[PDB]
Amino acid sequence: HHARATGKTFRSGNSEAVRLPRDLAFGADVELTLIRSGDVLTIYPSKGSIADLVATLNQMPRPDSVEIRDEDLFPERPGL
Template sequence: MRTVSIFKNGNNRAIRLPRDLDFEGVSELEIIREGDSIILRPVRPTWGSFAQLEKADADFMAEREDVVSDEGRFEL
């Protein structure tokens, strides 16, 4: 088991996360306490945040190839 030191950073307590425990490509962590444990999880986009993303241009994919051909289809 590895240990890290806790230090003061202004009015907060902080730790340094060792490089090999880094969350690659993540700039924000969720932190929760469960009993005497503190759990860090990467904050990832949710479906709720999907609606807040920038919308595609009106002509996005306006001209595109058919993905499914009519070959083998029959009229009803």
């Protein structure tokens, strides 16, 4: 699940299909969400919608304040 491949569409039934090599494949019982934007297809496990996520969060209390991030985390290492 940290891999790259190249492939070619083929026909399966009355539908296009795309082969998933073993290193990239999802479990056979995993429901997937497939979303296309332009020519880019994004595929990931279906675990709830964004509207549901936001509704769930809004039904919950929230912390008293929003954390002030620290982005500057990488130390200065001697010698690279």
